[PDB]
Design a protein around this nucleic acid. Structure first.
Lengths: 52, 85, 83
DNA sequence: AATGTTGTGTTTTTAACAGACTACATT
DNA sequence: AATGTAGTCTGTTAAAAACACAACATT
């Protein structure tokens, strides 16, 4: 049920650039916040972008 | 049925053009010893593919790496190899 | 002057160039995401086919011919189903 | 009989990978 | 304002390498 940043971005309504979505993670704009196992982030299926 | 083909006029798969280019390369082999035939075939094929994708994205590296399914860094490192920046 | 050529003698890089120009045209709006492995597989399968006929099934000779590890050769052969 | 090759493990090394982040451009 | 890109960096890790060797093969 955990996807990579690459996969989760594609599943979204409007997929953005990888560098932007990584900034979203850096700026905590995605809940639930994804853990970082090793070199990559693991998103949850349900995760969305909360508008601060 | 094959996705990558050339025009010869019949549509021959690219695997044929490689098979024929090695049969010709093996015939030219006047007893010489081949020690890095992989790097030689790869360099002859990476350089054209890099040129064509980069042309298609109009020089957008990110769109080009995303196209080939490779890291943007290894795209940049392979462009530096074949001297394309 | 080019080591790898196909029959006038045109280099192999030209045959690749024409194949992609043909590929890009056929793409009716489809999105590409794996073009490298698609091309590499179309080139690794014949080159393995050729040095295996050249060394007559001698894996050790074929691997040294290409400049790759013998296991790497074995691994790529298992990939394209050349057991 | 001697010598090379396969099959298949180890262990080390190289190369790809995802990401961070800034200056600048595009939307 | 938010997003996209190039360029330059970090880490993590998977591919590739080097090597070892009893088995079977070739000469």
């Amino acid at each position: 049920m955990y996807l990579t940043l690459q996969e989760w971005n594609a599943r979204q309504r409007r997929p953005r650039s990888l560098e932007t979505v990584r900034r979203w993670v850096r700026e905590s704009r995605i809940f639930p916040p994804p853990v970082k196992d090793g070199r990559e982030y693991l998103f949850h299926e349900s995760a969305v972008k909360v508008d601060l | 049925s094959d996705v990558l083909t050339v025009s010869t006029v019949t549509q021959k798969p690219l695997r044929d053009s490689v098979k024929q280019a090695l049969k010709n390369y093996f015939a030219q082999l006047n007893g010489q010893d081949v020690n890095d035939l992989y790097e030689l075939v790869l360099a002859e094929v990476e350089q054209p593919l890099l040129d064509m994708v980069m042309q298609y994205t109009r020089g957008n590296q990110t769109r080009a790496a995303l196209m080939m399914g490779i890291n943007r860094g290894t795209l940049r490192k392979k462009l530096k190899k074949y001297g394309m920046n």
